[PDB]
Ligand binder design. Sequence first.
Ligand SMILES: *[C@@H]1O[C@H](CO)[C@@H](O[C@@H]2O[C@H](CO)[C@@H](O)[C@H](O)[C@H]2NC(C)=O)[C@H](O)[C@H]1NC(C)=O
Ligand SMILES: *[C@@H]1O[C@H](CO)[C@@H](O[C@@H]2O[C@H](CO)[C@@H](O)[C@H](O)[C@H]2NC(C)=O)[C@H](O)[C@H]1NC(C)=O
Ligand SMILES: *[C@@H]1O[C@H](CO)[C@@H](O[C@@H]2O[C@H](CO)[C@@H](O)[C@H](O)[C@H]2NC(C)=O)[C@H](O)[C@H]1NC(C)=O
Ligand SMILES: *[C@@H]1O[C@H](CO)[C@@H](O[C@@H]2O[C@H](CO)[C@@H](O)[C@H](O)[C@H]2NC(C)=O)[C@H](O)[C@H]1NC(C)=O
Ligand SMILES: *[C@@H]1O[C@H](CO)[C@@H](O[C@@H]2O[C@H](CO)[C@@H](O)[C@H](O)[C@H]2NC(C)=O)[C@H](O)[C@H]1NC(C)=O
Ligand SMILES: *[C@@H]1O[C@H](CO)[C@@H](O[C@@H]2O[C@H](CO)[C@@H](O)[C@H](O)[C@H]2NC(C)=O)[C@H](O)[C@H]1NC(C)=O
Ligand SMILES: *[C@@H]1O[C@H](CO)[C@@H](O[C@@H]2O[C@H](CO)[C@@H](O)[C@H](O)[C@H]2NC(C)=O)[C@H](O)[C@H]1NC(C)=O
Ligand SMILES: *[C@@H]1O[C@H](CO)[C@@H](O[C@@H]2O[C@H](CO)[C@@H](O)[C@H](O)[C@H]2NC(C)=O)[C@H](O)[C@H]1NC(C)=O
Ligand SMILES: *[C@@H]1O[C@H](CO)[C@@H](O[C@@H]2O[C@H](CO)[C@@H](O)[C@H](O)[C@H]2NC(C)=O)[C@H](O)[C@H]1NC(C)=O
Ligand code: NAG
Ligand code: NAG
Ligand code: NAG
Lengths: 50, 418, 198, 85
Amino acid sequence: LTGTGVLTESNKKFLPFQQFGRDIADTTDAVRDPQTLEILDITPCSFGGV
Amino acid sequence: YTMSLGAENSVAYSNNSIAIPTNFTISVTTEILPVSMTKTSVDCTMYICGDSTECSNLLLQYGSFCTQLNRALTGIAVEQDKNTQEVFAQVKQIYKTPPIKDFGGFNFSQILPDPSKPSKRSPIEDLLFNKVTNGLTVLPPLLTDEMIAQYTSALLAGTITSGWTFGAGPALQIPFPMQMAYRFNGIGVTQNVLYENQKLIANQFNSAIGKIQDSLSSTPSALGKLQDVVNQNAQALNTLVKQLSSNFGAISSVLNDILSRLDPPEAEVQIDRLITGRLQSLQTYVTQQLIRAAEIRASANLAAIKMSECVLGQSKRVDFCGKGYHLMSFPQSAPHGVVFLHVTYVPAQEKNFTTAPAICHDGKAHFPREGVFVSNGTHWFVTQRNFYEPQIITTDNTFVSGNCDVVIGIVNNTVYDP
Amino acid sequence: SALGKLQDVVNQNAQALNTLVKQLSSNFGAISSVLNDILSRLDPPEAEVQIDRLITGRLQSLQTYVTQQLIRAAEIRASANLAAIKMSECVLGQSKRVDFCGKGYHLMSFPQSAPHGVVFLHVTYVPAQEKNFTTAPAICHDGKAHFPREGVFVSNGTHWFVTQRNFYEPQIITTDNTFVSGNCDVVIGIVNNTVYDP
Amino acid sequence: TRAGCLIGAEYVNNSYECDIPIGAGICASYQSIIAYTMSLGAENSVAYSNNSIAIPTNFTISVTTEILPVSMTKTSVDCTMYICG
Ligand SMILES: *[C@@H]1O[C@H](CO)[C@@H](O[C@@H]2O[C@H](CO)[C@@H](O)[C@H](O)[C@H]2NC(C)=O)[C@H](O)[C@H]1NC(C)=O
Ligand SMILES: *[C@@H]1O[C@H](CO)[C@@H](O[C@@H]2O[C@H](CO)[C@@H](O)[C@H](O)[C@H]2NC(C)=O)[C@H](O)[C@H]1NC(C)=O
Ligand SMILES: *[C@@H]1O[C@H](CO)[C@@H](O[C@@H]2O[C@H](CO)[C@@H](O)[C@H](O)[C@H]2NC(C)=O)[C@H](O)[C@H]1NC(C)=O
Ligand SMILES: *[C@@H]1O[C@H](CO)[C@@H](O[C@@H]2O[C@H](CO)[C@@H](O)[C@H](O)[C@H]2NC(C)=O)[C@H](O)[C@H]1NC(C)=O
Ligand SMILES: *[C@@H]1O[C@H](CO)[C@@H](O[C@@H]2O[C@H](CO)[C@@H](O)[C@H](O)[C@H]2NC(C)=O)[C@H](O)[C@H]1NC(C)=O
Ligand SMILES: *[C@@H]1O[C@H](CO)[C@@H](O[C@@H]2O[C@H](CO)[C@@H](O)[C@H](O)[C@H]2NC(C)=O)[C@H](O)[C@H]1NC(C)=O
Ligand SMILES: *[C@@H]1O[C@H](CO)[C@@H](O[C@@H]2O[C@H](CO)[C@@H](O)[C@H](O)[C@H]2NC(C)=O)[C@H](O)[C@H]1NC(C)=O
Ligand SMILES: *[C@@H]1O[C@H](CO)[C@@H](O[C@@H]2O[C@H](CO)[C@@H](O)[C@H](O)[C@H]2NC(C)=O)[C@H](O)[C@H]1NC(C)=O
Ligand SMILES: *[C@@H]1O[C@H](CO)[C@@H](O[C@@H]2O[C@H](CO)[C@@H](O)[C@H](O)[C@H]2NC(C)=O)[C@H](O)[C@H]1NC(C)=O
Ligand SMILES: *[C@@H]1O[C@H](CO)[C@@H](O)[C@H](O)[C@H]1NC(C)=O
Ligand SMILES: *[C@@H]1O[C@H](CO)[C@@H](O)[C@H](O)[C@H]1NC(C)=O
Ligand SMILES: *[C@@H]1O[C@H](CO)[C@@H](O)[C@H](O)[C@H]1NC(C)=O
């Protein structure tokens, strides 16, 4: 699951088989870290018009 | 079932019978008009390609599609603020109601701002705001909700304290019972009818405003227009985001997978397939937004015209500012829209009378100066047309024209010379 | 920048035409954006592919231009319908609609032609130099409630007059500019003054 | 600003008419470039009372302009010549 984003500590309670988390619009917004099982929220990098 | 078009009503027409109302009802009705959309902007290159650079190099071959899409979206975004400005910024002075709310018994507490609330919204406005709930950015509107409410409060204060004078020049103060007496004169009802019934009219108006608040609170489908606008915008944005999950005939919908699985020869054509699919989706979204923005601009122009002709003055246009004879209107700010409270005069408790076109007296034909001749069964009176106020037929409320030989249906009576 | 509304239409149309013309210089994935080069360089089987890419791109550009032109023409048609209604109701007559023919009480309007548009000169009556007065809903005289026929009761401090509502012209309260309705016991705020009988 | 980060404009505490709109009530103007919350208009408090009326003693005849677009330039882009020459 390649991409660019900001990873933070997440309080989301993933089920013991879920590796990814998607929102309403089917964009990945949380991933379970494989090496150590921790949930990392994906926040899009700070884009915007100038 | 075959639908019913309404209740049958055979009006008791005859060639000498008239129905004159003996009472009236002060009714308040709500009109909801959307004013603005959600101002969205799209980073077209980011939407099509994300972070990959050779996808943007391929997208460069299409010229200025992204620039034109951004220009259209920017035009829509500026148009939304323009719509809000034309609807609400209809006065250059922020009027304030006096600290003492002595308006001859009329009570505007449900539409005047509530100082207790931090948002400075009226109870009706607070209820209205409570009911309505990948390179894409949402721009905030130029006018905040607090400033729109400040415009609304200024308009309310202007119409309460000055009537229609503040929309045509300097605000000229007038007591509110006399203002509503002017508005009664504007619909063909004499002002003594209002002065002699001031408490009843004030109670009817207060009850109607309270019923408006209760009706808005208890009906979840009353604000369906604004909710439809919000849902349409949200659904269009959701569709645009979900279009990125389509492969459009390519091996995958992810550019990274295509890049890491194929060499540039066939990766170029697969990425081109994705580019044309996503660009078509974006163009479809922008065209839909342009059509929707045209509809919202029509609604906003209508709302601005409603503001000018119903809030800043009394309108003679039938059914434009509510059902019935329009007295005055009050604006209320709503999310992405405006709510008008239309106060109208609805005649009630009509009574049958025998009428004549003219009265023959001393070989002369008398016609009412401003009223209508009615007979209660034995005696003939002249009354104003919208309210039963029988008066003795005299030479001051009638005028003479010719003799009695021409008018069809002229009846004999005595015209008293004062 | 007074005439910015017509200039915006002119600039939008010119910019759309310029974008349409500049789209001819995009190759849309073909080897060249010039058709003559493709025709002079390749055999028909591959020239067909290149020309098909160019046709797809240019047809898409033309369809986009026509769609924006249709939407813009709908906006201009709405504006022209509004201008026709303004002509009829402001120039061919005096309108009572508030703020439809200027700011103030509309007297008349004058049209002036402009490039791709119309300019209305809205003559309005703006009240000025207002003065405070004490006022009463009615005048009680001989146990009768008198109400103004056309104006309003005003007091200059010691005497009561009746004046037309939009311009101060104080006149002696008489039975000709007032009408009688009922007693003095009903009207809230009725004041005592004499009503002159001529 | 709620519309985003603003660089190069000094946020004054005064309130003026909107010159260059930024968003969320903040506008920009050149006095140096300043940023400010837009002023909705001069504050006015009408002297309302239950027996006072303001009657104009004079009038001003004012003429204001309304500019309305009527027509666009009539173009007819030949599809075949555009696409194919
Ligand atoms: C005026 O009189 C007419 C007839 O005298 C009334 O019309 C009648 O209304 C009743 C009740 O709906 C019907 O059953 C009759 O068929 C009607 N008669 C006719 C001839 O139409 C009318 O209601 C009266 N209006 C008022 C205000 O009293
Ligand atoms: C006109 O209608 C109003 C109701 O809208 C009447 O007012 C009611 O009168 C009854 C009896 O006098 C009272 O019990 C109610 O409390 C009144 N209601 C309100 C809201 O004031 C009024 O009497 C009617 N007028 C005529 C002449 O019939
Ligand atoms: C105007 O109407 C409001 C509400 O309709 C009145 O406020 C009510 O006042 C009573 C007695 O003070 C309270 O018991 C209610 O709880 C109040 N209701 C609300 C919603 O606040 C108000 O008294 C009326 N009169 C004036 C002069 O404002
Ligand atoms: C029609 O109106 C006349 C005048 O208003 C009524 O005559 C009056 O009737 C009342 C009681 O019925 C008497 O107290 C008055 O003295 C009468 N005045 C005159 C001048 O006669 C008449 O009764 C009304 N008729 C109907 C059918 O309503
Ligand atoms: C209204 O009054 C006029 C005059 O007072 C009546 O006209 C006369 O009626 C009588 C009887 O029908 C005739 O003999 C005269 O020749 C009429 N004179 C004129 C000048 O017309 C008239 O009939 C009355 N109308 C009603 C309905 O009673
Ligand atoms: C209010 O108006 C009345 C009438 O226009 C003024 O009374 C007149 O005052 C002048 C000079 O003071 C006298 O020459 C007249 O004889 C007065 N006329 C009457 C009928 O008394 C009165 O002075 C005005 N009051 C104010 C405060 O302006
Ligand atoms: C307006 O005039 C009426 C009638 O001249 C006044 O009413 C009288 O007032 C006196 C003094 O209070 C009483 O003794 C009488 O009994 C009242 N008569 C009636 C018929 O009500 C009234 O007070 C005057 N109002 C003002 C403000 O001066
Ligand atoms: C009518 O009278 C009121 C109060 O007597 C005037 O309002 C005052 O105006 C001055 C100067 O504009 C202010 O300093 C006061 O604060 C105002 N007071 C209030 C309570 O608003 C009003 O200007 C007068 N109108 C005219 C046309 O002279
Ligand atoms: C009403 O306002 C007009 C201005 O619009 C006044 O006319 C001015 O009068 C002064 C002194 O009489 C002259 O110096 C000006 O040149 C006049 N101006 C114009 C444009 O004519 C007029 O006097 C005012 N009327 C009243 C009764 O106050
Ligand atoms: C996998 O490696 C991490 C890294 O230290 C370790 O903490 C973990 O215990 C290992 N085993 C499992 C089953 O996650
Ligand atoms: C109504 O018609 C009758 C005839 O049916 C006639 O006698 C009467 O004068 C007419 N009344 C009016 C007001 O036209
Ligand atoms: C205005 O209110 C006062 C009491 O505050 C009262 O005496 C007076 O009659 C009222 N005037 C009108 C016109 O209602």
